[PDB]
Structures are given as structure tokens and as C-alpha cells.
């Protein structure tokens, strides 16, 4: 709308309210659309037995489709952007405008793999609220979008080629933060809930489950195959709650052409660590808080009192 | 192929309340969902209600809503039916059935209606 | 609240003929449907489900077919073990309120 001069204003991604109103919102968007057949939420308020609420109600089958979603000023704020082509999230802003509304964001539901969102206008970006720390998400941002196509049927295809490319990339990325004399290994996920161990996502209604392995087992700057990949899927209707702490079912699929194709555009990964006089970094797909999610996309923009 | 077998034939006083059992042997018990069906004499079948085991979620026929209860033990592999304030015309031979649902315990599950799998029922007589 | 109602309450058969069994819903249960045998003293045996899918170990003269609000059981040479009372039963509705037919009783015509 309008850039501002001499203004240098200062971010802090991690600590954003636009992020915490838009999972409000995105999650408020997925209960009149898909509605499950039962939904299972504890309740141990009291001091002694615990509850469970249970609710039971007509689940129709919808073709899942999300439109992007703009985040706009609420009354009384403003929301300032900034414009810088390579921003961390954290710091001051020298070259900063005012904006109506946000970009349209894609409000995808998904662990490991951020799907048909922004691309990095310049090289990769990695970034997380404390590198330090082995237990919070690091956010992967491409600058190549790499093709992920997932059927009904049981798969998805990723090209190996530029998926290695992908990977060399992150890698140089990595050791750029924790040190160029260091091996990077990736490596599977390891352990959790199903939503989390695999990259798990949602598609035509469906929620999809796949094993994430093949992606995840190379080693970088340590000494010195097939066309494509193919992740084995699994379509499952009991799924873990990521609105809150719970279980949902669904109805099995009712359509044999079940098919979509995304662009990977980020990933989600969080670093082993610990103390270990060992130069190699471990790295795994993580995710399950889309916070995260939605933080690789609102990282540019924060809310202020006008 | 699971094989169902439930508790001995009752006796009630209109009004008691009664608690039949049924002994899934076999196959893995959270894989299926059990269902409770009755019988009166010379009557047709009347489907009572059913319990997603794995969930341990039951739902109930309208008729009997506020006064029927299904619940499973897993770790005894045997489903239960609580039938209360019993009534004469209450009186009718119950069966419990079941049907398996998939890998249920990997969040696979069909949430069948059909029954494959019968008990060899039980006569509960209500009567003053 | 689906009524299901089958015809005729009592089918007659000639040993060795064919026997058709209908069986109707108050609206439509698309394809949750299925059939069921019972003979006097014993629990009900599946026979067929999804309207027209044999459960295992049901012979191939039992067939079922139809959708929506009609439906039929065909037994295309009866047997003497086939003389029984024969329930559908509708599990098309959620939340889950199944229902069944009062019956078809199919008897031996002498």
C-alpha cells in the first residue's frame, strides 16, 4: 500500500498475535467443513475420575479444498510489513510499508512438508526461535519448489533428482548455522504420534499418512538411484486431534479417484543435539504445531496500536 | 473368525435390572465392534445398540435410550449389556453379535453395520 | 425413523425351484443393506451384505441385489436347508439407528 521512509521498526516472529487469530480462525473454518462422524475430548476438571466428552453427529463427505485466507487489521490496529527479500523474523526492519490485509495464505493442515505455500525470492531460508535449542522447529524455506503427487490408491511421487538437490541445499543451509566443518544426516522421524511420524496431511477430505523415510536418510559433507520416489500411503479414518487434545472419526473414502499434487515449498525438521563431541548435526521431520505453519507465512508481518 | 459366547439364561422380577456378558474369543478383540440384538418369542429381530470398541463408544437404539448400556473389557476380551428397569415385555432371547472393522488399532476402520458374528444367545424371562 | 417391510410374511416353495424375497425401506439406504437366515432355536446367520455381497462360506444360489429403497433375495434352487425365516436389515443411517424387516418365513409347498 504504502512504504515507509526513515521508519525502521522492529519484529519478533515468535511473538506474534496474527499467528495465534489465524489459528483461531483456521480452526474454526475446519469444523463447518469437516465434520467428523464422532469426536472423543477429555475432561478430568474434577479431582478424582476422569471424562471423556463424547459427541456423535451426521459427517458428510466434502471434497476438501482450501482457499487462500487473508489476515486483515481488527479495529483499532495496523499492520506493518516488512519488505526486506532475506528477513529473519527478528530484529529492526529498515525497509518496512503499511498493508490492508496479508497475502492470500493457504490454510493447509500438514506435518514434515509445507505444502502450496511462499517460496524463499532468494536463496533457502532456515529459521527457529532458538537454534540453541534441540527441542523447538526449524522452518525450511525453498527457493525451488519440488513436486509431491499423492493418489488413494496408497502413494506419493517425488522426483529423487531434485529432491537431492532440495537436500543439498538445506544441508549447505545448516552447516551455514551450526558450523562448516560439521556432516549433516538426515534421518527418519523418531517416534510420536502417527500425524507426527509421518508426513501426514489432508486431500480431497481424506487424511493421508506417509511414510516419510526415503526422504529423510542421507549423509552431507562426509567422505566424498531410482527416477522416483515413491512414499508407501495409508488413507486412515481415527485421526489425533491438532485443534486441541482429542480424537476424531471419520467415514472411509467414497470416491476411487482420490488424487492431488502439491508443491513442497518448506519443511518442518528439528536437530537431535545433545552433548556429543561429535562434528555431525541430526536432522528429522517434525511439525504438528501449525503455528509453525502459519508462522512461514506471517514471519514478515506484525499488528500495531494505531 | 472371532466365536462369541455369552453368560447363562436370567430370571427377573419386572422392574430389576439385568447384566448379560459375552466372551469374544479368537481374533483381536479392538478390531471389532460389537452390537446387542433381541429376540421376543414368535417376534422378529430388534437391534438394540452398539459399541465401537476401540473408542469404547456405544450408541443406542431411541427406544432404550436412558435405560440400556453396553460397555467391553479389554483386557478380559468380553462385551457387556445392561438392560434396566426391566419391563414383562422386556422378556426375549438376546443376542450378541459383532463384525470387524479393519486395522483399527493403525486408525483403519469401516464402521460396518452388518453382524458376521453371533453368540448362541441368552433367554432373559422378566415376569412377576 | 427407517421402516424396513418385507414381502410377503410367508413365500411357499416347490423343493428344488427358485424363491424371490423382497424387502423395502421407508427412504433410501442406498447400498447398507443385508440379509440374514434363522432357523428355529438358532442365532441369525449373515448371508449377504452391501446389498449383494456374499458373506464367506454362503453358497453361490443365494444372491442379493438392489439399491436405494428396493431390494431382493434371490435363491435360485432351494435346498432343504434353506427352509428358514429370512431378515433384511437396513444400517444406512448416522448416528446409527439400524433397523430390520419383520420377516419372510419360506416354508416347503407340498
Known amino acids: 500500500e504504502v512504504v515507509l521512509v526513515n521508519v525502521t521498526e522492529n519484529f519478533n516472529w515468535c511473538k506474534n498475535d496474527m499467528v495465534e487469530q489465524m489459528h483461531e480462525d483456521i480452526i474454526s473454518l475446519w469444523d463447518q467443513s469437516l465434520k467428523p462422524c464422532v469426536k472423543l475430548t477429555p475432561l478430568c476438571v474434577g479431582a478424582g475420575s476422569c471424562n471423556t466428552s463424547v459427541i456423535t453427529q451426521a459427517c458428510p463427505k466434502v471434497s476438501f479444498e482450501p482457499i487462500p485466507i487473508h489476515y486483515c487489521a481488527p479495529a483499532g490496529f495496523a499492520i506493518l510489513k516488512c519488505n526486506n527479500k532475506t528477513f529473519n523474523g527478528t530484529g529492526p526492519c529498515t525497509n518496512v510499508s503499511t498493508v490492508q490485509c496479508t497475502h492470500g495464505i493457504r490454510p493447509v493442515v500438514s506435518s514434515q512438508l509445507l505444502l502450496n505455500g511462499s517460496l524463499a525470492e532468494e536463496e533457502v531460508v532456515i529459521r527457529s526461535c532458538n537454534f540453541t535449542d534441540n527441542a523447538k522447529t526449524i522452518i525450511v524455506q525453498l527457493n525451488t519448489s519440488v513436486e509431491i503427487n499423492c493418489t488413494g490408491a496408497g502413494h506419493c511421487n517425488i522426483a529423487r533428482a531434485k529432491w537431492n538437490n532440495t537436500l543439498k541445499q538445506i544441508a549447505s543451509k545448516l552447516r551455514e548455522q551450526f558450523g562448516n566443518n560439521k556432516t549433516i544426516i538426515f534421518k527418519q522421524s523418531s517416534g510420536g504420534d502417527p500425524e507426527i511420524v509421518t508426513h501426514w496431511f489432508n486431500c480431497g477430505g481424506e487424511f493421508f499418512y506417509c511414510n516419510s523415510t526415503q526422504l529423510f536418510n542421507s549423509t552431507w559433507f562426509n567422505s566424498t538411484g531410482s527416477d522416483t520416489i515413491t512414499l508407501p500411503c495409508r488413507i486412515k479414518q481415527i485421526i489425533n486431534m491438532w485443534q486441541k487434545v482429542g480424537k476424531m472419526m471419520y467415514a472411509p473414502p467414497i470416491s476411487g479417484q482420490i488424487r492431488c499434487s502439491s508443491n513442497i515449498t518448506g519443511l518442518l525438521l528439528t536437530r537431535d543435539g545433545g552433548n556429543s563431541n561429535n562434528e555431525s548435526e541430526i536432522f528429522r521431520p517434525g511439525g504438528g504445531d501449525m503455528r509453525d505453519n502459519w508462522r512461514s507465512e506471517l514471519y514478515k508481518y506484525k499488528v500495531v496500536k494505531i | 473368525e472371532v466365536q462369541l459366547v455369552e453368560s447363562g439364561a436370567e430370571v427377573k422380577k419386572p422392574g430389576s435390572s439385568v447384566k448379560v456378558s459375552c466372551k469374544a474369543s479368537?481374533?483381536?478383540?479392538?478390531?471389532?465392534?460389537f452390537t446387542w440384538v433381541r429376540q421376543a418369542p414368535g417376534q422378529g429381530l430388534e437391534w438394540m445398540g452398539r459399541?465401537?470398541?476401540?473408542?469404547?463408544?456405544?450408541h443406542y437404539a431411541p427406544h432404550l435410550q436412558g435405560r440400556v448400556t453396553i460397555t467391553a473389557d479389554k483386557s478380559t476380551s468380553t462385551v457387556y449389556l445392561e438392560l434396566r428397569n426391566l419391563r414383562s415385555d422386556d422378556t426375549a432371547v438376546y443376542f450378541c453379535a459383532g463384525v470387524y472393522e479393519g486395522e483399527a488399532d493403525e486408525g483403519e476402520y469401516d464402521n460396518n453395520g452388518f453382524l458376521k458374528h453371533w453368540g448362541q444367545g441368552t433367554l432373559v424371562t422378566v415376569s412377576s | 425413523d427407517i421402516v424396513m417391510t418385507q414381502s410377503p410374511a410367508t413365500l411357499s416353495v416347490s423343493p428344488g425351484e427358485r424363491a424371490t424375497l423382497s424387502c423395502r425401506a421407508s427412504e433410501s439406504v442406498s447400498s447398507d443393506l443385508a440379509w440374514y437366515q434363522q432357523k428355529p432355536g438358532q442365532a441369525p446367520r449373515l448371508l449377504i451384505y452391501?446389498?449383494?455381497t456374499r458373506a464367506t462360506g454362503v453358497p453361490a444360489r443365494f444372491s442379493g441385489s438392489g439399491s436405494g429403497a428396493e431390494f431382493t433375495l434371490t435363491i435360485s434352487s432351494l435346498q432343504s436347508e434353506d427352509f428358514a425365516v429370512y431378515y433384511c436389515?437396513?444400517?444406512?443411517?448416522?448416528?446409527?439407528?439400524?433397523?430390520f424387516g419383520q420377516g419372510t418365513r419360506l416354508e416347503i409347498k407340498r
Open positions: 452391501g446389498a449383494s
Open positions: 436389515q437396513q444400517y444406512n443411517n448416522w448416528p446409527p439407528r439400524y433397523t
Open positions: 479368537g481374533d483381536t478383540f479392538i478390531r471389532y465392534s
Open positions: 459399541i465401537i470398541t476401540i473408542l469404547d463408544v456405544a
